Amino acid sequence: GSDKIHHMLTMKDIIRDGHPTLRQKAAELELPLTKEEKETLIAMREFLVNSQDEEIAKRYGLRSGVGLAAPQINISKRMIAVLIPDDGSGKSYDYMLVNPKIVSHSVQEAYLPTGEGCLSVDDNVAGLVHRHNRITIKAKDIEGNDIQLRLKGYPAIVFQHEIDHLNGVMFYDHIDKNHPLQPHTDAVEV
């Protein structure tokens, strides 16, 4: 549930840290998806759309997000939605993915300088979350077609955050408790 920093689901449908489902390893899905699974993915994306719309988000008390993983709505299945709106350059990320898996991990690390938040986490944890600056993901889309993404920088970070949810990993598991805000030598600020 990467935060935005640049049935209609509502915030109570998003389980909170401490819920067991967030710590489980989600199930690989067979394609084609069931109708319920498709509706789930579509509703996860619609929640991000709603959360990004200033009026709808204010009207329904939504926290703005750019990613959501199915475990966060208590569905232990490997599905994520990422919706990073146009950053001003025309680059936009609108992907509903099934069984996403990182197949190439960039050695150079990158991090958001303010750390990371998560829609499932109300009590924020300070610290840099070092991630791969570049990644390649293989996944299936909602119709079971093949998608391979090459991502870098912020979008890479967002997808890594969401994929981590499928493995029961939260952003803070990456935080070095000894030197939380110290960037790794090689690391670059996103």
User: Least CB distance from residue 143 to Fe ion, whole Å?
Assistant: 26
> C-alpha 86: how far from its chain's center?
17
DSSP secondary structure letters along 132-186: ESEEEEEEE-TTS-EEEEEEEHHHHHHHHHHHHHHTT--GGGG--SSSTTPPPTT
Name the binding residues.
118, 161, 165
- Taking the C-alpha atoms of residue 111 and residue 128, their distance in angstroms, rounded to an integer, is 6
Residue in the shown chain whose Cβ atom is closest to Fe ion = 118
Segment lying near Fe ion (by CB under 5 A), choices 17-25, 83-91, 116-124, 131-139: 116-124
Which residue do the tokens 């926290």 mark? 63
Among 1, 100, 115, 155, binds Fe ion (CB under 5 A): 1
The verdict on whether 39 is a catalytic residue reads no
Q: What angle do CA 140, 141, 145 make, to 5 degrees?
A: 70
Segment lying near Fe ion (by CB under 5 A), choices 1-9, 52-60, 97-105, 177-185: 1-9
Size of the site for Fe ion (CB under 5 A): 2
Among 44, 80, 97, 118, binds Fe ion (CB under 5 A): 118
User: Least CB distance from residue 185 to Fe ion, whole Å?
Assistant: 27
Residues 28-67 that bind Fe ion (CB under 5 A): none
User: Least CB distance from residue 101 to Fe ion, whole Å?
Assistant: 18
Residue 177 burial (CB < 10 Å; 0-12/13-18/19+)? Answer: exposed
User: Least CB distance from residue 148 to Fe ion, whole Å?
Assistant: 23
Which residue do the tokens 């990456």 mark? 174
Determine if 127 is a binding residue for Fe ion (CB under 5 A). no
What does DSSP assign to residue 118? B
Q: Are 39 and 142 in contact (CB under 8 A)?
A: no
Name the binding residues for Fe cation.
118, 161, 165
Segment lying near Fe ion (by CB under 5 A), choices 9-17, 21-29, 115-123, 126-134: 115-123
Active site members: 162
Which positions touch Fe ion (CB under 5 A)? 1, 118
